[PDB]
Amino acid sequence: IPCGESCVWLPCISSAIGCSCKSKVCYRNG
């Protein structure tokens, strides 16, 4: 599920809420 954050050039600030970079945007479990 996309979280609402791009990660093309920086990692996910939303890593704190569980979101990780895949396919240039931040996701939690799809």
Residue numbers in the entry: 1 to 30
Sentences from the paper on this structure:
Cyclotides are divided into three subfamilies: bracelet, Möbius, and trypsin inhibitor subfamilies. Since cyclotides were first reported two decades ago, studies on bracelet cyclotides have been hampered by their low synthetic yields because of poor oxidative folding efficiency.
Since Ile-11 appears to be critical for folding of bracelet cyclotides, it was of interest to explore the capacity of this position to tolerate another branched residue, Leu. Surprisingly, the four [I11L] mutants exhibited yields from 13%–44%, which is lower than that of the [I11G] mutants but still substantially higher than that obtained from the native parent peptides. When the Ile was mutated to Leu instead, bioactivity was retained. Contrary to the [I11G] results, the [I11L] mutants exhibited equipotent binding to the POPC/POPE (80:20) model membrane compared to their wild-type counterparts. [I11L] mutants exhibited similar or slightly higher cytotoxicity compared to their parent cyclotides, whereas the [I11G] mutants had substantially reduced or no activity, which correlates well with their membrane binding. Overall, these results confirmed that the [I11L] mutants retain the biological properties of their native bracelet cyclotides. Using this I11L mutation, we synthesized all d-enantiomers of I11L mutants of bracelet cyO2 from Viola odorata and bracelet hyen D from Hybanthus enneaspermus. Having determined the crystal structures of wild-type cyO2 and hyen D, we were interested in definitively showing their Ile-11 to Gly and Leu mutants have native-like structures to support our earlier NMR chemical shift analysis. Their structures were solved using racemic or quasi-racemic crystallography.
